[model samples]
Target: TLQSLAILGATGSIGDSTLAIIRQHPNRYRIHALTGFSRVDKLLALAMEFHPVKICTSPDNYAQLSQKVTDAGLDTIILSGDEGLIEIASDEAVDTVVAAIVGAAGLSSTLAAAGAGKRILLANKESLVMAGDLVIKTAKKHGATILPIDSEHNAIYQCLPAAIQADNTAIHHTSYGIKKLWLTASGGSFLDKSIKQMQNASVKEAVNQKISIDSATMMNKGLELIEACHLFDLKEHQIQVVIHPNSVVHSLVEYVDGSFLAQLGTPDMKTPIAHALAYPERIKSGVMPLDLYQLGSLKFLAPDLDKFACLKLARYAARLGTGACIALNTANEIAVEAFLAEKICLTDIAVIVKACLDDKTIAQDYSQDFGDEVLGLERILTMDKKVRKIATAKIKLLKQ
Candidate 1:
């Protein structure tokens, strides 16, 4: 009676929280497969403990992992690259797939799980940012349930009416008198830093450099904005972003009658991970309850578009449709990479992303094919490549 699980990007932070939940509830869930990118040792250690039936890794690390597994006297089958991911993700034996992979590299397998009608716990924001239309359509058409694992989206999911929560497509905001969705942000490590300080930000400043950069620019919230629209079947205008420095409040939902519902707790990823893992049911996630006695007053502030221009660009991208969303995300990836390598400053990230969006060719070409039915993964990849090239050129120009 256990729900067999396949975890993609099993070496990531989201994966860590999910695995912690599974480790605590071995009777309820079983790891059917585990996939990692470059961390062979970590993946193998996880495989040894969980004893998943299959494990996937990068081609470069496949041989190393294979030998290690065989030497360990484990019966786990070693797999590699994109094909292995799709196979395990769509396998009939697996009941749930945790799509926690960080970037667009996760697109194919996540889509495969949707097409296979598996319950998908999605942490990869890029999938929706790149191909929201395709993912949502595929999920609905195949009867797959997508449970968002991000803290903010999961909180929103908790606060929504059960009907809409049960089936995301059941969203009829007007019919339900739902006014808007509120996404909260922590404003990252550089929240109080001035523009000059952000420009000189180094990669070593934060534990997770990429996410730290996105949070500093508030682009992570922007990406989550797109994910929420796809998940709840809402338009871009229906969602708003605000900075909640305390991070105790994950997200809020506003009804037309001036009532607001929010899910609050300690800032533990395990809480949301446990919520999604045992959705439609409750489970102990080993996260401690928040102590209200010592807590001080919380503060919220309006996001400054002038300072975090990447967020503004993300909203513009959402309105412009899938092509622009892909362009925005891909261009940001390039820009972030350049910033991390010290090729460009942190502020230049927004500058690079905006240049890609303002391209006349991207605008004209994507105008007609903007409908959900017309966009697919192939075109999504094409647009991603084009945007990366454009964004690269923009970064080079900035460096000059």
Candidate 2:
């Protein structure tokens, strides 16, 4: 019996790495749906290559994608817009939904997969960061399974005992003596640079706008920290972030008995992707095996929260509740866009996010927990909008 896959966000780096693995294991997995946004060319290429039963794109390119599918003489069903995405995600045929679509956009389909009890390969960290409580509860309610596709989370997953590794929701109470989850960071591009020096150059060319800006401020790790909190069912303080510039060991898990277990591999997304894609069963991901003998030694250092204020803000939001986390993500998105556009400096990203958090007009306190019914999809969206609007205003104020 082959597992059917829906590769959401099928045009980006995650998509590329995922397909590479699926391509190797034709007997184990089949492509059910491939979803993309603007890259019809890439989408069409994938559709032609895999010949999935369905394909999805935003409304802007639905007709264009439809035509391309038709011109190619394919019988694949064409889906468009948010409804289309949800439809394809919850489709009965898809066994594993790779939630790789970036930011808030991927939340709907990701939640849909969880609600439908499908196995979720979660590459979209935002889904957990924005609505971890909802995502987790929905998964448990529907008997859905989620395996982390991020390198750090996946590493921690591997280090965990087999009892907890199979299911994460019960990790909090299992007296397995799990001490702390160690999240390794590259310290990003400017590991030792001053704020004044960071303001001058834009890192747009090396990576995407969101990631480039995230690395400059180390917010990527911050987002991941919040994500790990939800994924592992632990509080923000239970996890520690360390700067391992070598990027060899993805993450570590410290036990109460003082045993530290780590997962080391070459810096590649496919490693984790392959790990999650074949959870409970390891398969060749085609990623080159790490050579420990050639690599002499690994280095580790503590992350500078003073320098990386984004990291500190992440913990603050996690401590507050779901509303604050959503607000933090919302503000960061707006701030990153502003910084990318040169309206504000790199250091201003944290400033804008902090200001948005302080603004009572944008912040909402949860009724019970961050994952409470009060913080459902509808409320999350509302908070997201409120924060974006307030953050945009703050950015304007900063510019002035």
Candidate 3:
């Protein structure tokens, strides 16, 4: 049976990896729809190649993309923004959705796929961090299946017991005797730099600016910790982060009997993408096999909280529950933006997140029980807006 897919963020790195895999085995998968934000030309190129039924882009790009699609002699419908994303994600034609759009922009469509009970290849960490409770609840109610595509989460999924993996509920099965999860990080490009040196890093050093900065601060892992909690059904205390500069080990599962099951491979997105694409089965992902003979010693160390305060703030937010997680994610986005704009130092990213978390308005929201409630998209966006405001205010203060 062939699986039809709607690839959100089809113009991004994840999209490229996924499409490359699909290109290799065209008989296995079909592209139902594709979406892009800024790169309409690239999105158009994907549509030209894959011949998706429909394609999406930002509102500003819609008209241009539409005319270009017409000029290309293709019939693929062009859609834009949230409405367009949701349509393709939940369309009857799409059985699987690659939720790879970065940041909060990807949340609604991810939830839409869950509501429609589609198999979700989840790469957007913000969807889980901001609304994991609701996303999981929707999936359960609608009979959707979530397959993590991020290397770390997919690695954790690969290392778990078959029973837990089948049902996607390691949290419920105490019989598995799981101890803890170990998340590994390359510690980004600034692993050896002093805080003073990091503070002085040029804006180009950050994740694309945002993600680069998050990686530098280890907030990327913190966000992953939050996502892992939702994906594996664990509490904040059940997961630990270790800095592994090699990145050979994706992640690990520790058992009560002292067995540590792990997944390791060369650093490539295609491995995980292919894993989720042909799950319960195997496929060639085109990534080179890890060469142990050439590989040297692998070292793991505890993260310095002083150096990576974002991870600490993320843990704090996780304990405080979903609302704090939302604030943490939103605040971090704004803070990173401020840092990129040269309004604040790289270290100030954590300061802004902590400030938003401690703010009375945001604190009251996080304290409330968001457990399994459909907080709805509107309310979530409201909270996001509020955090962005508070973070912007904090950035202004820092500038002064």
lDDT of 1 at 197: 79
Clashes of 2: 0
The residue ranges of model 1 lying beyond 4 angstroms of the native Cα positions read 202-208, 368-375
Q: What is candidate 1's TM-score against the reference?
A: 0.96
The whole-model lDDT of each prediction reads: 0.87, 0.87, 0.89
Residue 343 local lDDT, model 3? 84
Compared with the true structure, what per-residue lDDT tens digits does model 3 show for residues 232-329? 98888999998999999999999999999999998779999999999889899888889989888998998888888899999999998888999999
What TM-score would every model get versus the actual structure?
0.96, 0.96, 0.96
All candidates: CA RMSD in angstroms?
Answer: 1.8, 1.8, 1.5
Predicted candidate 2, C-alpha RMSD: 1.8
lDDT of 1 by residue, 1-400 (tens): 5899999999978788889999899899999999998999999899999999999999999889999999999999998999999999999999999999888889989999999999999999899898888988888889999998888999999999988987776677467677899999988877887877777777776334677778878889889998888888888898999899999899999998999999999877889888888888989999879887878899999987788888788889889888889888988899888888888877888888888899986766576453354457768887877787888888888788
Residue-level error in angstroms, candidate 1, position 29:
0.7
**Looking at model 1, which ten-residue stretch has the lowest summed lDDT?**
365-374
Among all candidates shown, the one with the greatest lDDT: 3
The lDDT of model 1 is: 0.87
